Amino acid sequence: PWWNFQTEHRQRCVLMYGGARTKNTHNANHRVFIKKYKRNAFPNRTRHHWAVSMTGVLSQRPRRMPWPYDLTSLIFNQPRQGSDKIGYVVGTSMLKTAVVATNHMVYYPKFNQRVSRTKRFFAHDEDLACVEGDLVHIKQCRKISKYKHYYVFSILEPNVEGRERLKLGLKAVPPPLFGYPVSRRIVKLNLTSTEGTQEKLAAAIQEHVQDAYRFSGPTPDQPRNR
Amino acid sequence: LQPPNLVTYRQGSYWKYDWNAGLAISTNLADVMDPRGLNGCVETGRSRSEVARDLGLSYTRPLHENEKKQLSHQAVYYERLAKFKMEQPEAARAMERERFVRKFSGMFVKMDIRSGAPDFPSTYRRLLGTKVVRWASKRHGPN
Amino acid sequence: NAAMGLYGGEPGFEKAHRVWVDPDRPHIKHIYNQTALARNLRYARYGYFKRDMHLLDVDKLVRHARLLPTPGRLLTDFLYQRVPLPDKSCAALIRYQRQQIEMLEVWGRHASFQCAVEMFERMIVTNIPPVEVGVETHGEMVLCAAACGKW
Amino acid sequence: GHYQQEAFEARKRFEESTTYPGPIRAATPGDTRFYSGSLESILHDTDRHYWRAVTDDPRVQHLIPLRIRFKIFTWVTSGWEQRMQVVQIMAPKDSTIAQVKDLVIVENQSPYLCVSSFHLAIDGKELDPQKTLGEYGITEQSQIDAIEQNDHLLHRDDERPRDWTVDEITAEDVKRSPYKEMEMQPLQNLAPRYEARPKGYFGRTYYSGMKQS
Amino acid sequence: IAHWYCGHKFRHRFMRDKRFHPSLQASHDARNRF
């Protein structure tokens, strides 16, 4: 009897008349986090875990749920969830493939609004028709490779500019001038001459050994005296 | 009109400007190319390439040197193998023996669900650290 | 991160050490990048290279830099910093001026050629620091004169 | 039985018919490569992965899947057992027996099957390597086997492969072709694992098509 | 708001929630938020 009070509970074996017999899982448990690492010495290098981290895939707060009511489902009568996807082909470097960026939708009930999340897929195509920029429609099919389970069904928009550039021999799209950063620290352009290459190398190695010395910790207020 | 950055371009947002500007799909496709072979049959489910091959059309983009070389190398495979097996059966038979014994001496000769898993490290992650050592990353592709 | 350190936590072994790239022979793809904590585009312009002007390739700096000043003021900065100028440095300055000569029109490059000859006069009157006016520099100057048509 | 004869009669009358402008290529579609399920299943040339409720016009088959049955002496733990293997080749409609032999020896892809010269035979009757399938009337349902050079004396123990269970294998014999693949030395990992069946799997007698009890 | 989640002060929990806000979600206009 969940609706009955604590003192009103004469027994707990069955529900006498009807309702919902639910286990009273104790939410108020006062879970404790035990600090097992130094403040600046957490084993992970990117994300630090300093408190109780909430666990769950869909039960987390704020609530996030899939939204099947999007453009793809409005256009297509999908036999299976996510069977058909419309997206732009971005990246054509693997033979008989076409990488397509299609965006799904996730809904937040708490804020009562939706946002779009972009996901990339590998779409198989024959005769190499998919050129960069085409608005394509892809559908699920049999597994083709380790990461290929979509295939293009129709090229809604042909990239005329890309095809003409390919005919002229140039790339379908100029490569972007900005990419992923290789390292967090900034990359400084090297312009030293041949004579100064060794000096620049010495300076760089000195900087690296200083960064290694930083592992030691704070320098003592009193210099070491024996 | 060079793409701003690779991080944004990979997610297909460079071409999303055409979608956002209202010019997403406006090209007069019939004039630039035949639209009969650029779609797919819903009843059969065959793709645009299948429709093109059924109608005798070929919508092939201009190709660079490397893809043409790949296509030629893959095409020459059967012609090379047919003559090689006849002319020099010694090495072919040795390789066949090695493969025949390799199929016996391997991992999961039975085609169960574990072996059939296309992405073994991604599917079985809980044993990737303590049980197996062959893979170091739990995922290798977009999925 | 596998090469240095096991998991991290030890200070000085989380972030990769400083990486230097030769733009003429790049060892990375897309050297410039955009990130909240990895903005390196601003660190590839003129002004950061004054610290190491004593040992650098002026030709490479001309080839790849941002907000590069005029060649006359660049030479003035070099002289004021008293960095010795070898033959290839002088040739690089002259070809940097010639790549503006070419940009200017055929009939409108007389003023720029006069600027170039004034720069050459300053170079030959530089005295200290030692400026090496060499055969390559003379060839670059003759090429600029040919471009200007002042036979 | 009935299907083959009725298909032949229908094809004959279709050929004899003269008032036919020809099938529409656009209206008649081909088989698709993409479909549900993670298996690539090939069907007959007249079957499609999609539902096709209309019976299409019959066509002359330009590619017959000839299936040749080879003897194979697989190594079971109890002993050597002789069983059957099928090698399938795609030969044109008028392929001579010479090119059929070329196709079978190029598509056998087994180390033991094509060890020596062999002749193709049907129901025990040898096939002349000069005429084509048209003379023999060979269809896709024809049962064709092959007879090797030394399969007429395989009943002899000397011709039979020698198992280590009953026969002694020498230091020169372990260096031979099949006995190198087989491993008489039990390795820790036991790399050559083979099919095993008990000696009493078939009872006191071996496998037979009749009853002996 | 459970006290063990995120930091001791509640503004830690609120800042942690703000990274999942739909209006501030990572996109072309708002990228590299952290």
Added chain:
Amino acid sequence: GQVTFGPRNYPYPSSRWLARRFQMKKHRIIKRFRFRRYKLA
């Protein structure tokens, strides 16, 4: 720390008394770091 801790709609950037407690901490930190820098130099 939070120098501008003034109440809601405070017509001034901060409080003079509150600012001194932050200036003292800043001065002490700077002085100790400068002295240690001089010693290690």
Added chain:
Amino acid sequence: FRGADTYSVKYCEQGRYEYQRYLMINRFPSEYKKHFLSFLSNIRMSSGSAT
């Protein structure tokens, strides 16, 4: 009170199967062929000797 009096009287006036609307359930062509073949086989025979 979950009693019948709480439910609307209009629940009792409806005809049989009028509550269900029209559904448009489409499937892959391969699934359509599989289902058609299975239904044809079941129509031809559904059990060994109990059909």
Added chain:
Amino acid sequence: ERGLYFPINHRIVDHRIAPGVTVEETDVQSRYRRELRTNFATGETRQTIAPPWSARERPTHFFSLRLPSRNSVTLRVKEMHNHLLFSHQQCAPMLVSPTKLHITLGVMTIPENSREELVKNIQQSMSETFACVQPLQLRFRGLGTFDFGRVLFIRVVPEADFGRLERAVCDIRRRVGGVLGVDLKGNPHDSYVPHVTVAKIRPNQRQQLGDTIPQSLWADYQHHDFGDVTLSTVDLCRMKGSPDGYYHTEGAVHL
């Protein structure tokens, strides 16, 4: 160990065999990839299917797009022939002469007994249907195979003027095979695929030149670009090129 334990390319199940005989009775062993090689890779192009009655008698006449000898495709295929002859000298009889190149739009068999009245109707229909179409431009690139590799032709990708060309050829088929009875190899409601034949094995040459053209001869040029050619004439011709050293002229329309 190199990759997946069971590659996707090797998970092939054959439905041509009986269901219960593959598990126990026998094991089928074959290379199933060859028959599933796609038409794009193997160069096969689906030609219009001819009925059995029309597939027996040999053709008599054919429509073609007459082109000047100076056209770009002629010298492109000339250089292709030079490369082929330099690489292998045995494919010269298979290779056709550069002066016998035309873009075929349809093939038919006019009986010789009643050819005179049919050719006039055919030529007048061609004139009346081409009195309005402007000269066409076609971009040729790629290689294809007909008659199981017997005929090697240059593919015609869709491009500008190709839609007009296919509409015109459909109208020609309607006006020639539809209203008046002439044996078209295909169907009047079907559209013939234009092509120019670069290599072909004659039935008499089938005795010693093999059964098909090996793919290695044209593998490198399977996707070669032969460029854009403008056509402004049409000709109904007959298979007679040897006597005059040129295409036989039976009907012509200056489009």
Added chain:
Amino acid sequence: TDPVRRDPTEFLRVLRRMSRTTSWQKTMLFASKGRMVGYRLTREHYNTVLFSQSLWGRALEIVRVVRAMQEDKVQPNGATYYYIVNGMGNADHGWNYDFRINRRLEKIQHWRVALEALEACEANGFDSTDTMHNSALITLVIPGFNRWQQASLLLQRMLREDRRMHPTMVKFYHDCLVRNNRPREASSLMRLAAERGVHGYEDKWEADVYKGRPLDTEINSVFRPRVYRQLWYKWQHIANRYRPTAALKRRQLAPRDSPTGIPGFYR
């Protein structure tokens, strides 16, 4: 760099601390960078580096630092030979999923390096302990490659020198013998171990069956040095030192939603 960190005594002390409480990568990188920029490295520095290298049991780094010492013309003591032979003996090796842990050992040829290190340590006049010889024999016989003749010669040398035999090298040599099909040598090793009294082979004694004739992937195991699972060993014995076969697991030493302390349990 400030003079306090520029002082080479600070370099030595920080390098020693790094070797005491870090991985091999830290010490190797720091020492290499310091040698590159100033910081004249001495025999003490080289021995400190070799300490961590041997602790982590790596061969390529050890041969690199040995080549560096040869270039710098520093005369080493017996500690260097002990460290290099122990590193060779502690080099990782394992057949997991038909895939060896280290494919570089075959190219490195660490057995020859261990043998020459032992020979040089004996020749130059330094003490030779049992551990160096046992490590050398371990390098000689492993599941990777078969080197039994040289191992037998080394075992005869140990027998005539009255040196102790370690159970790890005894087990490795026995496995190598049974894999190379030398039951006579396996029986001799079993007799020697039984006579000595090794913990593993105290009871295992067998009679001599070769009494009338005179003389003339496979293994699936993983071996790594102690330092890899020293933390696991320490916490296992701290938690349950009265039930050794307990399989120390989660929640035995840390409550829910709290770190267990050791990063990378069971690798």
Added chain:
RNA sequence: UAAAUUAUGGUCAAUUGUUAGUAUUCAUAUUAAUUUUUUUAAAUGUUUUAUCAUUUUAUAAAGGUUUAUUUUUGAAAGAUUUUUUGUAUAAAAUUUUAGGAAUAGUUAAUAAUAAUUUAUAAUUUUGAUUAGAUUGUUUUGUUAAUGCUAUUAGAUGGGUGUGGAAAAAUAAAAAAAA
């Protein structure tokens, strides 16, 4: 850019803590739960047969997984009989950490190829990969309520691979061929 009605219909939304100049949800209430007054074991021989054997008996806690766990009718149900018809390993979305950077027997094409083929490969700042935490998308608690706060048991590698299916090494509230 018109009003309503042939009149409450179609079935209950409702907030309670005696403070302490003002700013800001933060001491003490109520409900739910833990805590004292001693409530509260998980059983030891499964069975039949043609006898040194064979036949029937398939997911308990062990190992820490956030782009992740997915498959059969070949046994059985199962029937005059023979015979026959079909599958299925694949997906899509939701995925944690105060101070956030690189990851890897690796992507695609080819094939029952390649420890040694071909290619301008693939993952990731739209937050990846390692590391920490936690058995994933019908379970509670509180409130008038978009919230906040909980939940469980079980899929942790192969290596003669039996079986329809490995889930196969103590652990019942499963009657298992009279």
